[PDB]
Amino acid sequence: LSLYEKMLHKGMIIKNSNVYEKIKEIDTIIFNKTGTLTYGTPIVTQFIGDSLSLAYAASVEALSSHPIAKAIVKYAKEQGVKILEVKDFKEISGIGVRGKISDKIIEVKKAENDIAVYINGEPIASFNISDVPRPNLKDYLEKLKNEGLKIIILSGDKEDKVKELSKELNIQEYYSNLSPEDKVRIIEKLKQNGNKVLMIGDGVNDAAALALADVSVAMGNGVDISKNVADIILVSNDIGTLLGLIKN
Numbered sequence: 001l002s003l004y005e006k007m008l009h010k011g012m013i014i015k016n017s018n019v020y021e022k023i024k025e026i027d028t029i030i031f032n033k034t035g036t037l038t039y040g041t042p043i044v045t046q047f048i049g050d051s052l053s054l055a056y057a058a059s060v061e062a063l064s065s066h067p068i069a070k071a072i073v074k075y076a077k078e079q080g081v082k083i084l085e086v087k088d089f090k091e092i093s094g095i096g097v098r099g100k101i102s103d104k105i106i107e108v109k110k111a112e113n114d115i116a117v118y119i120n121g122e123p124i125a126s127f128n129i130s131d132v133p134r135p136n137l138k139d140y141l142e143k144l145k146n147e148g149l150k151i152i153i154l155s156g157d158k159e160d161k162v163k164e165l166s167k168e169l170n171i172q173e174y175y176s177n178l179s180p181e182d183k184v185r186i187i188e189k190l191k192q193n194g195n196k197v198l199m200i201g202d203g204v205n206d207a208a209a210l211a212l213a214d215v216s217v218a219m220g221n222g223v224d225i226s227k228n229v230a231d232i233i234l235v236s237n238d239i240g241t242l243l244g245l246i247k248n
């Protein structure tokens, strides 16, 4: 039907209307990592420590709703340990959680294996938690060879998580440990350098960068601040779908 309907049926909401004109001009495609190149769901990739520590950690995390707490709880159930009764539980907002089991103070909190487990102030185990990447690569390579598109990846994630993923999809140019303010500035430079930037984002740390892109795409599973500022919503959460469109 109408162009809007065609796109919607392609899995794309076009909030803008001028965006088509804008797309022919784009020469730089920037991906925010989290929830764009990956699902937005943290998993335990590794636990270091024993099963008693695992049980303690999950028992305490069972009382939090944070995605990380959930991922630990889920990992432990899969190992087959059961949830223990916790007393004097406390979330902290910044660090993590705390609680008392069998006369032992248990804390599960961040660190830098970012997540540590402390039994009576002594770090006893840790979790390495990370994301699940979306299936694909060729799609992106079709971009590289499509037009002469430069592809950049950005995230507030650590240089280890980002380097690994960029190695994976074969992107040379990426930047890690970035705050929104950093991202705004990188895009700023690019636009000042005369580049036309299309950016795909998803979630809190992407909104301000997206608002500043020449054309902006938010993911379907993306947060509201991101979507109310995006030119396009990939309600399909299917990047490939968006790719094709870039193949004008």
Ligand SMILES: Nc1ncnc2c1ncn2[C@@H]1O[C@H](COP(=O)(O)O)[C@@H](O)[C@H]1O
Pocket (backbone or CB within 6 Å): 061, 064, 066, 068, 069, 093, 094, 095, 096, 097, 108, 109, 110, 111, 114, 115
């Ligand atoms: N329930 C939790 N268990 C362990 N660590 C947490 C928890 N909640 C927050 N954190 C830590 O706090 C950081 C930032 O939290 P957030 O700002 O809410 O995403 C996370 O990356 C974790 O290191």
